[model samples]
Target: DPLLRTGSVFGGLVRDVRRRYPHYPSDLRDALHSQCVAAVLFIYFAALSPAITFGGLLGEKTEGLMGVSELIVSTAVLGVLFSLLGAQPLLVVGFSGPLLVFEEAFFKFCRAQDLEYLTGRVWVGLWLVVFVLALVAAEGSFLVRYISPFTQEIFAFLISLIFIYETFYKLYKVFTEHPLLPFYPPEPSPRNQPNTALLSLILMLGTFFIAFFLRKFRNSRFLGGKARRIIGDFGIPISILVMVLVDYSITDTYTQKLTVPTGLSVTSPDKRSWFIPPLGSARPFPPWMMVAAAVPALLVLILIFMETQITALIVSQKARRLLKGSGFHLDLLLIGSLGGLCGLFGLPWLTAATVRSVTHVNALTVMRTAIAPGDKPQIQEVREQRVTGVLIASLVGLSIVMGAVLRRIPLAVLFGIFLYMGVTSLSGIQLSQRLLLILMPAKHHPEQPYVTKVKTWRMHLFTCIQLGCIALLWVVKSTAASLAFPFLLLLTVPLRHCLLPRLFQDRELQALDS
Candidate 1:
């Protein structure tokens, strides 16, 4: 029963119950349920959308090879198992885009090198996972606190940009190439071919509007007292759900039945399939090759840890619960171990699912009476929502079994949903602060020395070291750069102290920190 206890079957049932009746008094239970539901929605979009758009580009056989169906099931299995047993119960795990890109790149590298028994690539992945788990078990997660918000924002912006670019490109293709939309206006493509700039712009703007309106609607007072009571305030989940539903409903009617593709087919005559890495699968493991693999793995592991912790912090706030001492270290170990297990199976490694979990927690939170400014405020609590996870998993599992039948979902809709995610992510970015700082005039003072703000020069020196690490990450291709970026970003406050003298006047530095 240990396996059952930590596995999807029982976890799935518990998750489903919470989803159905999410209104709970305990913050932990509500947080758990909310994150699970949001995670399910994310996986659904991942499985359904990529199959319609990226499948053909990757030479996947709709009927046989390593198709979308396999990816979904594998990711779900890993995600559910890990979430059920992981140290942080609120965290939702799933396959991440960056990990998948690396896997594909490795596969291509193996083919080009004429590497016989290319299946050994799994070993390389496993090695990466082991490295992560080892770091976790050693209680290395604390190192992440050194990361700065600037670096986190930069990386997050880069990832979001990639999604935006990809979504626009696909939407443009549909607008320009489709016969029905022949007369539709066209624009030059940055990457070549006819661009659907007009349509892309329209879709992007439309997605933004939908997300904004949904967020606004959640807080709207138009509904009556009773109706308003049922509807919760605006947050991540409400925004995602509204966008997903609208995207699916408004897009094309044609459904492309999902099937396994040829090259990736596990059942093909020449195809290869194994749940575990084969021993002696290749020649003596070269140190150079590991060096190559470790570079990206380390960087990605750091990002995953940072993202996970951020989510944990946010979810904790919503649930009004704080981690006991050393909770973060335990969480990282769980994540790293799960990442390692997935790598061994040649499946994409998972990361903390941000959007889904945030949305879920917000949805389950109920407002209690507000107290006066001087008085201690009454606390609002989240309702039971864990069942949502089980429901989502069951639905996704059902989709996998009926792969061919469910592939009928339109690509346009999924693209729209993804677009929604991209826009929603921007909610955390402070555009006004960024623009204001850029436009503000610099003030000069002759009386005070810049270094006078801090008590000692040693503090300023430490800040420079931290910033230097962040700068190095932008140019360096080493694993340390990748792993260090996230941590460096989170630890920005103390790190900023080091740079104060150089960037700001003495008075400014004191005012900034205060």
Candidate 2:
């Protein structure tokens, strides 16, 4: 009754934030400690700007809309502003890959139906919000329990693959083509310049290797007995600067540089429709078409539900320094409103970002490096506060001021950061570890209960089944049936429960589940 008394949809969030407002530390010293770390988080996290804009890229290329500039400005403003106002300060909102897929698919669907894309896009957002509200009223957030660790691992695997694949493909492009703009087309007949290709490879791969090495060895005594604290704070920045310093000597050949805007502006490349109203002009929504649109909207809603809650689950995992409370329902209600608002304003829809949220936690955390247990670094304390998110998101919004400076960094260099993130993220995942275990000799396998004197035949059978399921997903996505992607993903839940139990024992199932 008390939750029901939290008032209207918007009022509910206000109530949640009000009651949990005390979640922020009362001690200014604790909050103040987050500033220096916050600034670094702000800049490094801005690197994610390119990936977030991927949604805009699809919208622009497919629907003939100006997407890149609008997404950057809108995300920076919304992400930062929301941190200060939203209930879950740790939720880093951004354009998600599945959202990208649906937006493009929706555009294609609209064109096929002779309807306007933006109009339909807006309707879908509204429809999604409608579903979110219904679920909240029904207390459907409690239903995430049905999502087992088995299913969660499948989603996590898909996400990690996306990160590695996108960044990896770009790395190849950086080396083969003109390096200045891997994001854009190379000038016609810019060919026959092997020198250009080589320089790009050198710059990109150089940055990737050094940055990886330094960060990996940041805690090592190999640096002539350097103070561990000095390297801890500056390891990444130092890695970046050292590469830049080395590349500076190859100045003449390294003509290729990053493509950064002069300053943050509302204007798109063509300088037209910097502002498009969501529904200022209407499409005559045919009854049949509305039904068809709603049909796909149902699938999109599932995609939204999965992406939102899974990211929250990642943030709320049993950890050293997380708060006692969970904000899954509050975040869904707020992000749902956010989706609709973004639709109305001609901005790309955002969801709870997994890697960005995890990175934010690590940044604010006082953690021991590689030597600490839990497979990698371990968190000791988290400087949880609104200021860090606000600072990080604000830097993304105001990127125009550094256009000239940002341009100096080679495109390959910045891309290397994406590769680093991808590589680092591959660890600490249960599904990943499980997959790799199949290749290891039985004697070398981990000491977990499932693998303790585990039977080789049973384990191989389990691995084979997982591979088949994952392969099925890839086939569906590849065959232009990607709209069915979410449906297949949801099928994992039933498989995890009904079908999986038919084979492995509960003890073995528990091991394979995670």
Candidate 3:
């Protein structure tokens, strides 16, 4: 037989099809169920707000080469494709934070080298497809088993800080740098109003606090669980709408708003084309440039692989009690194929959005075992279906026509949500919780498995190591070394598996890591 245990290259793909195809009728039929309809609305807003926020930020970073329109189209197109073609219909794909960092860095590199941004992006996408397909065929997803919570938590924490830092950086820039005219002297004039900065910060904080409070409102006694779920789920969009209305009511002051295109078209209509040719960005030194694209493609491969597989693991937690099987290989293939397609057409690539997908699973979950009022309830079953995803995609597609409404949303409000997302993502992350333990007294420590098993000094030492890793990633991302960020992130895996054994016992590692 063969030396390599490839398993079946197509085994997962075929198995997913065979297992889930039988439920196709019910998947469609179940859309009319009241719970399913509620899920559609919940997931729709949950997904839409992030797409707009990410898209707007991406537009600014890329100088309008890719914007809100690109994200919307990609979301709608890819969302539909994944729903119909991929195995896990419950996993939502949208704009991702780490991927955004990659794109921003990649685009800046393109500019420095006098290359076409879209062309370079397309080349990276093509190579990404090649790398991802190869990994799928080789069943490389199995390697994720080796990734400990130490690595996963660090990566997640780095991205969360990126979101939060990016928000504050933007707000800080609004205050320090002149928005309308940076060349002008600091004077009290209509062009540079200090009040504009103050209002922007106020609006940003208002949006963040409103959404923040509403999210926790689910646990409040004032509302029934059903009503609280609706309010909590729609919290982001509700906060956005409230802030926009507030901005409009303040007729005396001007605030910065999102600058979106008026119609559904490529952002740089005059300079760019819809289909991005691979060689379009190449100089006279053409042939080698095509091959050179693979360098960054390798980095993108790491990001997509980690983002997709890790989110899949989180979504399929045993407590959710999912009935349908997973499609690790098949979903990777789908993501690869879609990424390549997006590259060819000059669209922003998307992968499994971790927070959104977890939210999707939670939205569909119903409690079978209720706990006391203060305790978390146990999930019984997740209403896994394809209809809600398809419906959500359709609503995203509809946003193209709502450009004026989208433009009404202030950048401050979106950045507020950005801050909220960054902070919220850190919640429940073991590394984040462990970091907090550093400040608290020993007696104040919770009766958690990790706290009890791992000694306080040992736990603090491990957390400091994680802290150092995050600091290193943050520095690399802030500099031109950002292109190598994926590699830096990957190295942490070895640090956990290779270096940690010498520092701690196996039992302590398990308690702290898992």
Candidate 4:
């Protein structure tokens, strides 16, 4: 019993310690710590939990699968590397869903071609990763700035929308799909579908409230003023822990005996096996047809870069650091190298783990001052948080030893966590900006920075154009629509020149006539 408790305490302490140390600046340290905690919590609840719960639905093993061990080890390794050698040491990198999709596709291709050398594809992906890193090392990170904010916003909006939709859909299916109801049942019954949805909703709302309260009330210095708003303030880790405990308690109390299939035990070490690439089993390279894979590879690279840079930018902005001059290139190179390593092992390419990194940074930062009357204010500095990565990696490594115990957490709880994450991300969309009217008096209009000129008609036109594009995208998420969308974007430049003059009514010409 003491050994069990010791292991649990050790795991929790490791998580907390790593979260507390990352950057030397006090404010950044708090932010980073909070973010790391939030990220780890989220990963367990949102990604891993759901995968375990819906393993049957997805035709995969949940409890004691090799994927579980792979996920833990991969994330730990990537996190450690990023924390130590990266340019923006504040950023977190880990496995992502999109990268998984790409990996699945690559695996399917290998199988279809009868390429018994399955490891060869990993080598190919690693080669691509090397190329990406080389480019970044050569200062290609600057290319990210050239991408328009509008495009970035659109891309983010689409991804967020997709995540939110999927989250809700899964919750809905929990109620409608009876057999799967055992995975996430409502109150009074572990198999109650409707109750599961309601509980999930409640959990999601609770998480939002917690995050909001921390963001709002933690700013007041009445208490220990040093306890400023950080990632832990949202209580994500605590919330997840509580949810898992409750789920376990309920299962035990109710005497609900669910079937535990072979190769799917909750606490099994076979689930934590490492997969090394088989070097001698390499497949023959198709040199002439290599370009065939270029399109998808480029798409994946672009998505990864955009997501990583945007997350870094957000962290930099919130931390009040200038990103352009920051050593982002070094960070990108580190990320690329990590991706290469994962690819070599036939694992998915990793990107900046946005949610986790944001959480980690928030935990490490200490609010040093208050918001003053001016546009700027002295903020908190990061603390002794530079060792956060090492701590996180160590905690993750514990999964190798206590893999079964960690598997006790229910999948439904994790789904709730993911649902919460998706909803929270929607906060970044400037919805209120859409409500502003150009006809309103200048004084009455919201005085927003970077919006000096408000052409009401032009704004309306832009909205309509964007809507049309979105509608078109709905139909062609696969082929023609994606191709047409880029051309449509290019057409906007010429269209803007034609439309601007008409909207302005040539004020200069009218003045000369008078």
Point out the worst 10-residue segment of candidate 4 by lDDT.
1-10
Leading candidate by TM-score: 2
Q: Model 3 TM-score?
A: 0.82
Identify the runs in model 2 with alpha carbons over 4 angstroms from their true place.
1-19, 26-31, 34-56, 175-192, 222-226, 261-293, 368-378
**Per-model TM-score versus the true fold:** 0.63, 0.84, 0.82, 0.67
Q: How much does candidate 4 score in TM-score?
A: 0.67
Per-candidate alpha-carbon RMSD to the true structure: 9.4, 4.8, 4.7, 11.1
In order, candidate lDDTs are 0.49, 0.65, 0.76, 0.50
lDDT tens digits, residue span 70-176, model 2: 67776777777677666667778777656777777777766786777666666766777787788776566666777887666666666767777876786677455
By TM-score rank, best first, the candidates go 2, 3, 4, 1
Q: Give residue 221's error in model 4 in angstroms.
A: 9.1
Model 1 Cα lDDT, one tens digit per residue, 80-139: 664454444445555554444544555566567655323345555566577766664444
lDDT of 2: 0.65
lDDT per residue for candidate 4 within 102-199, as digits (tens), equals 55555556567765323544555656675775565344555544444444445455556666777677656755544433365334444533344455
Candidate 2 vs candidate 4, lDDT winner? 2
